[PDB]
Swiss-Prot record, chains A, B:
It comes from the Archaea. It comes from Archaeoglobus fulgidus (strain ATCC 49558 / DSM 4304 / JCM 9628 / NBRC 100126 / VC-16). Signal peptide: none annotated. Gene3D superfamilies: Winged helix-like DNA-binding domain superfamily/Winged helix DNA-binding domain. SUPFAM superfamilies: Winged helix' DNA-binding domain. This is Uncharacterized protein AF_1382.
Length: 91, 91
């Protein structure tokens, strides 16, 4: 909510979902991101393409499965956002 | 624009305006923030109140002049956003 004050909530949760899922050791599937966030599949896809345009993620097809990975740039950004979230939540 | 992808552009520019103005040594006046950002005075005031609620700024009246200052919390957040902006702009 203080988060909504500064961030686009939907795009943020997509980015951080990719971050935590990859950090945990999972290949990140677009379907998985959808199950975790409050957006329809088509909206997730749209945001992923925007991230790709911004050189923050790369995606590739493995058969019928879309896999998303953070670029070094996307990773740094997610890490910094993680700290902002921490700071915002700690009074 | 990649900024708009993740951030609320209007709130962001208000926060960073406070950050750079204070860093330069100015008392930050609400009127000044308005001259720098693309928002009407009343919208700036609304955002400032939200920041105040989030304990990121404090404001006070000096006569008829509203002065805004970042709290330690607001300062840390602005600093982290500064790095994100830098990262986003450097390919
Ligand atoms: Cl992997
Ligand atoms: Cl990379
Ligand atoms: Cl001062
Ligand atoms: Cl303080």
């Amino acid at each position: 909510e203080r988060i909504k004050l500064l961030f686009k909530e939907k795009a943020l949760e997509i980015l951080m979902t990719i971050y935590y899922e990859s950090l945990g050791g999972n290949d990140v599937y677009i379907q998985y991101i959808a199950s975790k966030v409050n957006s329809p599949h088509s909206y997730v896809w749209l945001i992923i393409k925007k991230f790709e345009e911004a050189k923050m993620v790369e995606c590739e097809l493995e058969g019928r499965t879309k896999i998303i990975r953070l670029t070094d740039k996307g990773q740094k950004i997610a890490q910094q956002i993680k700290s902002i979230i921490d700071i915002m939540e700690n009074d």
